[PDB]
Write a protein that binds this ligand. Sequence first.
Ligand SMILES: [K+]
Ligand SMILES: [K+]
Ligand SMILES: [Mn+2]
Ligand SMILES: [Mn+2]
Ligand SMILES: [Mn+2]
Ligand SMILES: [Mn+2]
Lengths: 199, 199, 199, 199
Amino acid sequence: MKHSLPDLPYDYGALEPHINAQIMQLHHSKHHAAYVNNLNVTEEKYQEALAKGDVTAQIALQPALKFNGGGHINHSIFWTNLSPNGGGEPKGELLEAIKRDFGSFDKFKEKLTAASVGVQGSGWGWLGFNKERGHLQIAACPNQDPLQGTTGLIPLLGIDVWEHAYYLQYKNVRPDYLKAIWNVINWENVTERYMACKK
Amino acid sequence: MKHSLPDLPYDYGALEPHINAQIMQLHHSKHHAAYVNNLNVTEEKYQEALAKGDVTAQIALQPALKFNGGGHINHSIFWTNLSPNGGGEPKGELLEAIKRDFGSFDKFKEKLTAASVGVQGSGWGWLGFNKERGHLQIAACPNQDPLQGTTGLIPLLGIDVWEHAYYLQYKNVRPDYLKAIWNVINWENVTERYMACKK
Amino acid sequence: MKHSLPDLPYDYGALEPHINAQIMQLHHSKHHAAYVNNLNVTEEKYQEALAKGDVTAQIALQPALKFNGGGHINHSIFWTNLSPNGGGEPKGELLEAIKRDFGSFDKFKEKLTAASVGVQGSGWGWLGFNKERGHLQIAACPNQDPLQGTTGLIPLLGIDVWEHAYYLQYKNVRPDYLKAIWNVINWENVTERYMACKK
Amino acid sequence: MKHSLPDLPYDYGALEPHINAQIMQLHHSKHHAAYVNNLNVTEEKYQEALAKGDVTAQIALQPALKFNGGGHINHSIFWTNLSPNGGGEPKGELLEAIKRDFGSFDKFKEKLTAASVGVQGSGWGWLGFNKERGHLQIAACPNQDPLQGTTGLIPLLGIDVWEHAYYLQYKNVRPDYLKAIWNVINWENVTERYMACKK
Ligand SMILES: [K+]
Ligand SMILES: [K+]
Ligand SMILES: [Mn+2]
Ligand SMILES: [Mn+2]
Ligand SMILES: [Mn+2]
Ligand SMILES: [Mn+2]
């Protein structure tokens, strides 16, 4: 078992004009590719350190493991959260949960937007599921810190607000990017992730 | 006393082909402008909270104050650290200190490059002066955390490795950007900052 | 304003046998007193730095302001959260909220105990109110980071798990302290704080 | 490997009056023992997660691995840094290094004391060796974050300023503990660690 770069499930230009082909190609073929390759490198070092009982060396590898590991986890989810067939609103039980937990779909969108706009530096906004409480929850994460690994929330929808996710097209104006991304959210996927949490 | 956006001391295209005019214009007129304006906003809120003794409100403002305050501090130094008249090596006492503390100028460049390349997410690489020890020191800082405010080191040379500093021109390849930036380092300015530390 | 050490609402021995008199006296008269005194020193330094527009100094003072400010906020709440007349369960709307959000009072105790036991190093366990979601929420905070200032949750009940809160009596056995403190929870105060969050 | 609690190099009462026997016994047999036991549990969980390629689980275990792993690393060094035959000043090349890098032995003590007193919450003060710069360096570390694993500096002398290291004897008065511990520093061990850093 090595970790592998998943293929993007649509063409690089499939999200235009919301997210351009240049961004999608760099983001997938350069950024994600680097995280998974560097993850495998870090994991092999960690296995060596673990088998030798070298605790210092394990601890020294944690930043790279969290960063590259998180990068792989986060982007793998992100690509499935987007789709040319996306946008609009979810339906069914997910929609019911959104209304119940956030008041309305628009109030939810404002809350996830606010979380995403509010990241200072690099990071992600998330809609997650709190297994303990049995309800939806919004959280922000710095850098590539992954949601489940660092908070326990099960990821449903992630919004990447690293500058590489938007800068070529939207420059400094992160809010223009967050307005555009709502048009390509794959609610079919977010719904599947939500229904997998409930039983 | 309000904080103010300092004018850039050369034309937006003065650093071409090392850093392009589009980057310089966005970086100064959008990014820095936002930090100083948001700094002034945060500072006024903080003065209000301070005068009321509202400790909760002071603490809630710290992230914005450090981020925008640091953004203003960092970029103000950064613009003076670059120049169309830059590149090459420093001379005099700065050069002597570099050789003494790092072995050689090239060994120093490798160490500051390594610090800058090593930032995971957004941040800065710094050459600083340790007043206590009386010598040079390299450090990295996350996001806009400023060097003197968070470590006590006096900043001499800063390298911005936020994606907005390089992405339009160099895309994901941060090492191409760090190779290019050596050509525009204003050693006259770094020398002035160094001599101001010594007495 | 010039912050002051609040009077303890009861005798130093009033929470025996659950928290001994030596601990209460130290905790109030030395620890909380130090936070107040250092908060006042830091706030005066911040006033000087604001007047000069010294952003570096403002940032350098943040750790002392969060630590000592947070220490004052947290302990001022903590004293009111305990009582010689405390223990048992709350009643009315707070108990209804606890049952709705955590399943039962005993499951709530389990979760707040677990958050408090889980703190690695110094910190606090909290029951808070989430104003946006209109429900209760458990969180943990490191060091003296205060709940409202760092998370937006309104504090209802805090459990101090700094070693100074229990060590003289319980030594390393934090879970024994956690079991004992349920006997002195002032549910009247927690109820007042909860009702204040609602209109 | 299966990590083990090392035997203490002396009797629990051998550092009296400076660190009392009750503290040493607790510190070794309960605190350090817990770090070892929890390190072993966490390392077995990491082995399971590596075998499955569960990156989320790997990341979720990082806090426990750094905390307990760091706790084992730090305390294993600390015991060897103290001795009933300790105190006074080092000699030879280590004393020459201390004088060169800090001005004098008394100025070195001032600086390491100040780093150790300055820790807000739980942590450690360290004298370390910087291999790249070929000189001594003082640093502070939060919680159980280990020196080498988090900074690259090689540990020479550690001062534990967790409340459990002093509280039963010194209560809140950390500076008194800091003054007393100079009487039991095992400069032979610190010297061995220093000579090992050089060729
Ligand atoms: K297309
Ligand atoms: K030009
Ligand atoms: Mn990304
Ligand atoms: Mn910048
Ligand atoms: Mn306390
Ligand atoms: Mn300890």
